[PDB]
């Protein structure tokens, strides 16, 4: 019944080349969970615990939640984690799907394990996104940092084209979060 009911921990090591044995797909820049490519038996160096089916959603790496991040950021987390890599995953099927917009529209009971996870995933998504809003700019706000200030017509165009991962309304205005960009601007 719960979204988290099939969650499990799989512990792996990196291959001689330094790879995981499978590819990572998805990520928030594509509106998705990070999820595994095809998992071919024999390619993953498992240590001990449960194994992985193809295309499981990746939720945490060595206790750092990565669901809600871009693929770049997920891979950066893995780069700084030391073997063994404890991966929290859940297989796709039923109510569990890689689509982040569908997932963020699910309403879980407050305080439930499903709810706590959803809010962690939202915090990750908020790390690399600026919300858009149709309400006017206010004193002290930096356009493009606090908000993207757009018209209602623009907002609805973003909704219709699937660019928004979540949206809502409050005091006569629309609020929403678009997908983060695939590659961020270099910092150094």
């Amino acid at each position: 019944s719960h979204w988290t009911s099939k969650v499990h921990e799989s512990v792996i090591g990196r291959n001689p080349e330094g790879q995981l044995g499978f590819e990572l797909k998805g990520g928030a820049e594509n509106g998705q969970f990070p999820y595994l490519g095809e998992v071919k038996p024999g390619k993953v160096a498992y240590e001990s615990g449960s194994k992985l089916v193809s295309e499981e959603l990746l939720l945490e790496v060595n206790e750092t939640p990565v669901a809600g991040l871009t693929i770049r950021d997920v891979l950066a987390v893995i780069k700084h984690c030391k073997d063994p890599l404890r991966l929290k995953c859940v297989k796709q099927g039923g109510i569990v799907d890689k689509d982040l917009r569908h997932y963020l529209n699910l309403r879980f009971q407050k305080g439930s394990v499903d709810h706590e996870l959803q809010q962690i995933i939202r915090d990750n998504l908020y790390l690399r996104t600026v919300p858009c809003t149709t309400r006017p700019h206010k004193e002290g706000e930096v356009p493009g940092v606090d908000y993207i200030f757009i018209t209602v017509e623009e907002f609805m165009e973003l909704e219709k084209s699937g660019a928004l991962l979540e949206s809502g309304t409050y005091e006569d205005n629309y609020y929403g979060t678009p997908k983060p960009p695939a590659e961020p601007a270099p910092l150094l």
Binding site: Y126, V130, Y175
Partner: peptide, 12 residues
């Protein structure tokens, strides 16, 4: 960045 109170109320 961190969402404001109005945002959180909107997407609850």
């Amino acid at each position: 960045g961190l969402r404001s109170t109005s945002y959180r109320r909107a997407v609850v």
